[PDB]
Amino acid sequence: SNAMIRQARPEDRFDIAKLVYMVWDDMELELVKHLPKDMVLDAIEKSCVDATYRTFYQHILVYEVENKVAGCIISYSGENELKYEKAWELLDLPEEIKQYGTPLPVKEAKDDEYYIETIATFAAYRGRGIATKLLTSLLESNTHVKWSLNCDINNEAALKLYKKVGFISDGQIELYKHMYHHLIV
């Protein structure tokens, strides 16, 4: 089969959930630290199709390799960020996860930005330029907007990648006890 960059579909949600889960685990989100993976995955999966959460499939482009989701990129308007986040409450979730509130309450972006929240690749597909390709193709989809993202200050390889496609520094932001470079293009 051909490799391809395309809009996510509902059936991609199970692979997307693993990717998002890995990112949230890195971030040490309390709910990930203290809740069963089974339950958190089910929740993220539902977040992709059942309501317009941050991770709605309509906000996601995937890189499909050999009929499998190799990676994904997640983006949406900064002005609707907190509205997307609140939609977590419309999911069909066990009470044990609902007690944690929504997973990402902090406003990561700014109202005049199209925020790229997540760029993620499965370990087995790393070293193939998948993140670069997803990013480049997403930026080309709308050259009438200001795109933004938040880069872990300890991740220089990402920062170089971002500066190479034309992002510039626009301050630093603290999110869940880690510091990030806020970048715009």
Side-chain angles (χ1 to χ4, degrees), residues 10-21:
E11 32 281 316
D12 296 323
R13 69 186 184 280
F14 304 94
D15 283 320
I16 291 176
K18 294 182 198 177
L19 283 164
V20 170
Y21 185 82

Side-chain angles (χ1 to χ4, degrees), residues 68-169:
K68 277 211 164 188
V69 172
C72 73
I73 186 157
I74 310 180
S75 66
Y76 44 77
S77 51
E79 69 173 347
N80 288 340
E81 184 185 349
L82 294 193
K83 183 185 101 211
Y84 299 141
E85 174 62 13
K86 192 168 172 51
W88 188 262
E89 299 191 319
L90 309 177
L91 304 178
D92 309 313
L93 299 182
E95 205 63 23
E96 186 174 353
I97 190 155
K98 291 178 92 75
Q99 70 209 5
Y100 281 85
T102 75
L104 286 160
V106 182
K107 196 176 183 276
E108 306 180 14
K110 285 178 198 169
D111 302 328
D112 65 328
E113 299 169 349
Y114 215 93
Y115 180 55
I116 301 167
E117 181 199 320
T118 301
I119 304 172
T121 309
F122 286 114
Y125 299 95
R126 268 162 211 189
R128 308 184 191 194
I130 281 157
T132 300
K133 287 180 208 305
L134 280 171
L135 181 52
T136 292
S137 158
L138 178 62
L139 295 171
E140 195 275 334
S141 75
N142 196 343
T143 59
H144 289 68
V145 297
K146 174 146 72 57
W147 302 87
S148 72
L149 64 73
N150 287 318
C151 183
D152 174 21
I153 69 158
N154 296 324
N155 191 342
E156 192 185 65
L159 177 63
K160 295 175 170 173
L161 169 50
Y162 303 143
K163 288 293 179 89
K164 198 181 167 162
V165 308
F167 285 93
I168 71 144
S169 306

